[PDB]
Amino acid sequence: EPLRIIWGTNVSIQECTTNFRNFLMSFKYKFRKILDEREEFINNTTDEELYYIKQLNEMR
Amino acid sequence: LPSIQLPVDYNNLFNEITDFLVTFKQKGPKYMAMLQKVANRELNSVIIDLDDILQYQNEKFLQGTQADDLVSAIQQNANHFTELFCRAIDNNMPLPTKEIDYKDDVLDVILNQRRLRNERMLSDLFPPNLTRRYFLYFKPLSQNCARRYRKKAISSKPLSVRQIKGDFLGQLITVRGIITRVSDVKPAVEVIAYTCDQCGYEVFQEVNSRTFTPLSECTSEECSQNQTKGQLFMSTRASKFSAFQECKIQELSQQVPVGHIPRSLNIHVNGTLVRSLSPGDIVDVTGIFLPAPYTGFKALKAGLLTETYLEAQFVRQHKDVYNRLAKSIAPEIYGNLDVKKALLLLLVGGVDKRVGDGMKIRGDINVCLMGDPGVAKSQLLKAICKISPRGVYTTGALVLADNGICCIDEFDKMDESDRTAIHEVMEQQTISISKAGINTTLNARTSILAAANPLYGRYNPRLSPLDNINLPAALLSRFDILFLMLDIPSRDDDEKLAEHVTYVHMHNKQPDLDFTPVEPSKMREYIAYAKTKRPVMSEAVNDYVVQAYIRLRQDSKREMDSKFSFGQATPRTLLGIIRLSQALAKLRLADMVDIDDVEEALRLVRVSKESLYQE
DNA sequence: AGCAGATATCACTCAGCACGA
DNA sequence: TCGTGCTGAGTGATATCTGCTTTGGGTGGGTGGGTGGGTTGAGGCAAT
Ligand SMILES: Nc1ncnc2c1ncn2[C@@H]1O[C@H](COP(=O)(O)OP(=O)(O)OP(=O)(O)O)[C@@H](O)[C@H]1O
Numbered sequence: 001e002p003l004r005i006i007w008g009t010n011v012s013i014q015e016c017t018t019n020f021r022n023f024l025m026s027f028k029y030k031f032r033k034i035l036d037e038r039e040e041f042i043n044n045t046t047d048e049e050l051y052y053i054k055q056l057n058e059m060r
Numbered sequence: 061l062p063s064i065q066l067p068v069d070y071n072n073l074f075n076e077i078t079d080f081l082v083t084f085k086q087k088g089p090k091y092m093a094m095l096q097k098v099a100n101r102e103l104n105s106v107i108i109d110l111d112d113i114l115q116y117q118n119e120k121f122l123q124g125t126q127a128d129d130l131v132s133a134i135q136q137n138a139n140h141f142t143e144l145f146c147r148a149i150d151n152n153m154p155l156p157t158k159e160i161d162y163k164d165d166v167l168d169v170i171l172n173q174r175r176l177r178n179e180r181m182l183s184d185l186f187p188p189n190l191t192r193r194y195f196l197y198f199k200p201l202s203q204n205c206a207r208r209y210r211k212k213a214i215s216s217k218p219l220s221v222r223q224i225k226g227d228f229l230g231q232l233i234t235v236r237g238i239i240t241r242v243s244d245v246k247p248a249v250e251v252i253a254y255t256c257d258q259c260g261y262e263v264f265q266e267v268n269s270r271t272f273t274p275l276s277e278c279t280s281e282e283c284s285q286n287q288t289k290g291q292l293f294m295s296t297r298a299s300k301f302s303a304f305q306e307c308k309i310q311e312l313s314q315q316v317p318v319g320h321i322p323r324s325l326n327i328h329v330n331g332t333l334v335r336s337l338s339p340g341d342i343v344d345v346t347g348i349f350l351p352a353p354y355t356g357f358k359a360l361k362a363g364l365l366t367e368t369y370l371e372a373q374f375v376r377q378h379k380d381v382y383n384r385l386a387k388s389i390a391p392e393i394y395g396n397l398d399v400k401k402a403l404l405l406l407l408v409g410g411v412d413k414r415v416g417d418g419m420k421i422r423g424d425i426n427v428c429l430m431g432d433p434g435v436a437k438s439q440l441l442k443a444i445c446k447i448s449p450r451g452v453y454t455t456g457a458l459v460l461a462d463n464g465i466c467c468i469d470e471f472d473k474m475d476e477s478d479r480t481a482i483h484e485v486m487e488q489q490t491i492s493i494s495k496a497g498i499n500t501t502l503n504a505r506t507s508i509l510a511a512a513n514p515l516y517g518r519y520n521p522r523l524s525p526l527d528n529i530n531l532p533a534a535l536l537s538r539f540d541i542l543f544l545m546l547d548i549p550s551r552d553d554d555e556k557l558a559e560h561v562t563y564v565h566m567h568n569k570q571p572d573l574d575f576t577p578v579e580p581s582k583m584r585e586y587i588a589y590a591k592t593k594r595p596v597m598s599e600a601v602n603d604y605v606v607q608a609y610i611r612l613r614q615d616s617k618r619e620m621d622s623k624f625s626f627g628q629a630t631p632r633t634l635l636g637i638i639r640l641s642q643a644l645a646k647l648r649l650a651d652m653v654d655i656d657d658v659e660e661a662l663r664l665v666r667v668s669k670e671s672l673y674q675e
Numbered sequence: 676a677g678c679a680g681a682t683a684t685c686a687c688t689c690a691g692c693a694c695g696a
Numbered sequence: 697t698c699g700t701g702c703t704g705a706g707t708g709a710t711a712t713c714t715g716c717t718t719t720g721g722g723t724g725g726g727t728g729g730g731t732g733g734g735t736t737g738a739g740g741c742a743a744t
């Protein structure tokens with residue numbers, strides 16, 4: 001099948017597209033909180049709610 | 061193109077270079093270890109020491125297998141030997157010992173795919189500089205090593221800009237001078253990578269000139285064969301770039317002949333040597349003197365006349381406490397203890413400026429010296445400016461003085477515009493530019509040292525102090541401390557002054573032997589330590605300062621009832637008193653401000669003006 | 676050296692006819 | 697009404713030669729302009 005690759009690299013454009021779509025569809029700020037070593041500041045409503053889905057809805 | 065028979069055989073010299081790189085020792089070979097480091101991406105610059113080459117030649121001669129003089133060949137024509145050494149290094153590059161992510165690099169993938177395409181075509185390439193990940197430089201032959209082996213070191217002998225003539229072109233020479241200009245670092249293209257929209261192949265181009273003509277048409281075998289006309293498009297991702305910097309080196313004052321103007325020589329910096337030269341530093345730049353041919357119509361119109369520049373290869377950079385410090389400020393002058401102490405207080409400039417209410421008391425203990433001609437005002441200015449790290453000397457520059465003392469000479473002669481500029485510097489501690497061309501505002505918390513002469517040239521006792529001073533009274537009031545210096549004739553003082561000056565003229569050294577001046581380095585580092593320090597004051601000292609303030613205010617009002625007083629004491633005098641006390645506490649290295657410091661500041665204030673006025 | 680205009684010599688398309696099928 | 701040449705001059709096209717001009721600086725000028733650059737120093741003038 002035609003397979004699209006960024007010139008000079010071996011990264012598949014399809015893989016990047018699907019990864020970004022998955023990240024946008026399912027992501028919560030609690031992951032950022034745990035990454036930043038601020039896990040004990042996690043609440044139960046905002047950090048457990050989808051972030052970029054809400055951003056897209058507000059943008060629309 | 062008639063030929064000549066020159067006594068140089070590049071094959072033998074290449075063999076010599078390879079043997080030197082492989083075998084030379086000074087553990088394993090030094091340059092083999094360097095290449096091993098380069099392979100593992102640990103080093104990006106290789107420097108060839110001509111001393112090592114000379115030692116290797118001496119050893120070979122001692123062993124009986126006399127070889128060609130490589131040092132002289134390198135010195136006489138260094139441009140070719142750079143490429144020769146690069147080729148020798150490439151032919152003997154050790155395999156990497158530390159695994160690296162090859163697939164990350166774009167060039168690796170592109171070359172691997174080119175290899176795959178070539179294999180496919182065969183079943184039915186790139187410039188060496190493209191893959192090079194290091195830079196080569198030549199270190200001049202040290203004079204000590206040359207004298208040890210009975211040889212003359214032309215490369216390492218310093219030369220002035222004038223001594224660099226046309227017969228030195230193409231050689232490795234050293235230049236001594238002061239850098240006057242350095243440009244910004246910019247990317248210089250060496251190899252250009254193109255792409256074919258139709259073919260799918262990559263093309264490369266080598267640039268060794270000021271200008272180049274880009275490719276337009278594909279030259280690939282496939283394209284040619286198939287007759288497909290494919291356009292070439294530049295690709296900056298796969299291209300090779302090297303940091304470039306252009307600098308100007310000017311002659312030193314002692315190198316110019318009598319009745320001649322200094323000259324300048326261009327310098328080109330490539331590779332990792334970038335950022336090694338800054339304006340104002342005296343340097344010993346070693347490089348290859350080369351011409352810069354023109355191109356196109358300019359080439360034809362110019363004629364035989366050629367520009368020149370230097371390819372940088374190596375850069376060598378040239379280099380009771382209160383009383384002691386005061387006396388060591390300017391040993392050459394006759395003892396003026398109070399003025400020296402005031403200069404110390406200005407230099408340290410200790411202060412706590414953290415009001416946070418919208419403004420903050422000025423953190424500079426400004427000093428102004430006014431006196432008749434004859435006092436060593438210029439000497440104090442020059443000395444105190446030299447000691448200061450940010451001291452700037454100007455004649456009636458502020459930006460350079462930011463967060464530092466400003467050394468202004470001929471203060472009275474200054475134009476009114478500069479008077480307003482310094483007024484803005486004091487009251488607002490800001491530098492503002494309002495121009496069409498540009499609009500930049502730079503903060504300036506800089507202290508000012510001012511030297512001025514009276515209105516009539518010499519102080520007139522009959523006239524009031526304000527009359528003798530041309531500057532506006534507000535500027536005088538804003539000055540934290542004002543020192544009036546006068547020359548009163550006297551047998552004893554004149555005799556001592558004459559003896560001191562005569563001894564200085566004869567023996568070229570300080571006449572005083574009662575005490576030994578403190579080393580300037582110790583004094584400056586002590587000043588820096590004091591500046592780093594932060595003092596603190598209590599409530600009792602605050603009440604003492606308040607009492608001193610009321611006493612001073614009453615005394616100053618009584619004095620100003622007459623015309624002799626310079627001016628009435630004001631809250632500005634207060635703030636100056638606390639500033640001086642904080643500076644003295646910083647000097648003491650004790651956090652708590654003591655009553656002794658306040659008393660010393662008060663006596664300094666009294667002796668700055670009244671001591672000399674009463675005389 | 677590079678660029679824009681021009682000359683002239685290089686092929687290729689539709690045109691159509693003779694034989695036989 | 698398909699296949700295979702032979703004829704053919706027309707309609708291209710693309711591989712191929714013939715003349716500027718330029719940088720910048722007065723070794724192109726001021727009937728090409730000064731808003732396309734140069735350009736710091738001396739000089740005369742009006743408002744001050
Ligand atoms: N106390 C002194 N001891 C020795 N030499 C001195 C002293 N005071 C002044 N001089 C000499 O005076 C000479 C001229 O004076 P200087 O330039 O130092 O200051 P100044 O008279 O305040 O200057 P200006 O004439 O520019 O107002 C200097 O060469 C300096 O050597």
Ligand SMILES: [Mg+2]
Nearest residue numbers: 437438469511
């Ligand atoms: Mg002076």
Ligand SMILES: [Zn+2]
Nearest residue numbers: 256259278283
């Ligand atoms: Zn191609």
